[PDB]
Design a protein around this ligand. Sequence first.
Ligand code: HEM
Ligand SMILES: CCCCc1nc(Cl)c(CO)n1Cc1ccc(-c2ccccc2-c2nn[nH]n2)cc1
Ligand SMILES: CCCCc1nc(Cl)c(CO)n1Cc1ccc(-c2ccccc2-c2nn[nH]n2)cc1
Ligand SMILES: [K+]
Length: 463
Amino acid sequence: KLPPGPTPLPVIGNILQIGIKDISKSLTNLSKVYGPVFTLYFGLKPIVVLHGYEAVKEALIDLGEEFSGRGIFPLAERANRGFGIVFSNGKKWKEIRRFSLMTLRNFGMGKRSIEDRVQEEAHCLVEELRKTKASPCDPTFILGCAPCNVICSIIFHKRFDYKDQQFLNLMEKLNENIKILSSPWIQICNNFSPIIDYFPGTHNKLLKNVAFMKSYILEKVKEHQESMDMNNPQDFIDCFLMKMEKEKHNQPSEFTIESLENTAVDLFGAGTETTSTTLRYALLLLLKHPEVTAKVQEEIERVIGRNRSPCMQDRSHMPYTDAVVHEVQRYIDLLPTSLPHAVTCDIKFRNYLIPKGTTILISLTSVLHDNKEFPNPEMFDPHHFLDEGGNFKKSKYFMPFSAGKRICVGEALAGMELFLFLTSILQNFNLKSLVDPKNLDTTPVVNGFASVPPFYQLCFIPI
Ligand code: HEM
Ligand SMILES: CCCCc1nc(Cl)c(CO)n1Cc1ccc(-c2ccccc2-c2nn[nH]n2)cc1
Ligand SMILES: CCCCc1nc(Cl)c(CO)n1Cc1ccc(-c2ccccc2-c2nn[nH]n2)cc1
Ligand SMILES: [K+]
């Protein structure tokens, strides 16, 4: 017997019982009557919901191999998304993910470290912010460019100028697609139609945008094919190609030019928007709490000077800064239900039989906003990650990147972008609101399965 739940209506299951505006809050309300493990029917499709640390840990960590499937909805097929890492399953996922973790290690692709690629980008970000000449600024475009250029330097071994036309084109297609993918019509309502696609023009537009990106990625693998130094892989493409060489006597291989294009598209997708949004949010929270910004700056000035770039080594000597970055991710909760999981086999889970391929929804909100681990969890307070002495207090409830076998591939890279972009910004600038700080609102704006910050402007005032 599946876990207990609200009795489904015929055909529509429990769809009339969930506010699709704020799915996270509905899931939380259902946990107060059905407890931490409960079943919802998305039109005869059973979804099991895990709410709370204990259930999420039990599934994602204790039974990690069983809860490592990606949940599949019609959008996976309509947008052709199951051929990289994010939406792939089985052998294809296991192999592309294991290759991807190895290649994304700090020194995973040659002498030039990931850290060096981000440090370079952090310098360019600081230069673009100077060019705003301390005038009112929606930082959305600029903060979106930085993480996107890090992905570019990781994949193609060289970053673009922010004014370069091929870059603005890629950036434009990525943003359109992310904005389309974020509509409840595309991510929820059209998924209720298992066979008929009610938005065929939208899916076409998504697939044209991907094609454009895939075409640029192919132009570059050609350029990498001719200038190939075995004994010197520079980037994700060099490492992927020479993985293909080692796979030449073992076809059919999960490593092909097709799976490189699709993997690259996933890294652009996964690695841009969430980092971008987290940065934009961090600046809003620093605007709203200027004392916090001032203590970060004190750590910056004391531990780092004004004569050198920040570097990751500084983070262990900057507990307050580390607490702030950790409290930004915890407070804003950008992926309140992560991405859906699926069980990879039949599994007994607290005396509930969950059949192979049943969709699992993880409430990361329920962990990040635990009111016992983080007292007053709806408040931004760096003290949630500090002890009485001022040292960094780690939390097992810190899961903005999810947990277990599907944990975000970019966990380490995101951690570096956030630490280095934010320390580089505050080492070179003070932040000025156009509205009085006490007025600005910082509560997440939820639209289905994602949180975004409110609109805001600020001035980057050189130090
Ligand atoms: C603050 C930034 C980020 C956050 C909060 C974040 C969070 C997440 C979460 C919650 C997942 C879903 C894990 C699950 O399936 O349960 C995910 C997946 C993933 N993230 Fe990130 N992510 C971020 C940045 C990045 C970056 C920079 C990359 C760059 C490589 C990346 C690559 C991926 C990939 C490939 C997956 C799919 C992993 C898989 O299905 O096996 N992410 N991320
Ligand atoms: C029919 C194949 C055309 C695909 C396509 N490529 C691009 Cl580029 C455009 C720009 O609109 N488009 C067309 C397009 C037309 C309507 C939508 C749309 C916008 C808002 C609400 C619903 C739709 C929709 N999609 N399918 N039917 N209606 C999206 C893309
Ligand atoms: C020019 C191409 C732009 C990016 C994009 N458009 C399409 Cl369509 C794909 C296939 O999913 N992609 C790649 C894609 C891969 C993973 C995601 C994903 C990663 C982590 C957390 C949430 C997202 C997500 N999925 N859907 N919307 N946002 C988003 C986009
Ligand atoms: K149409």
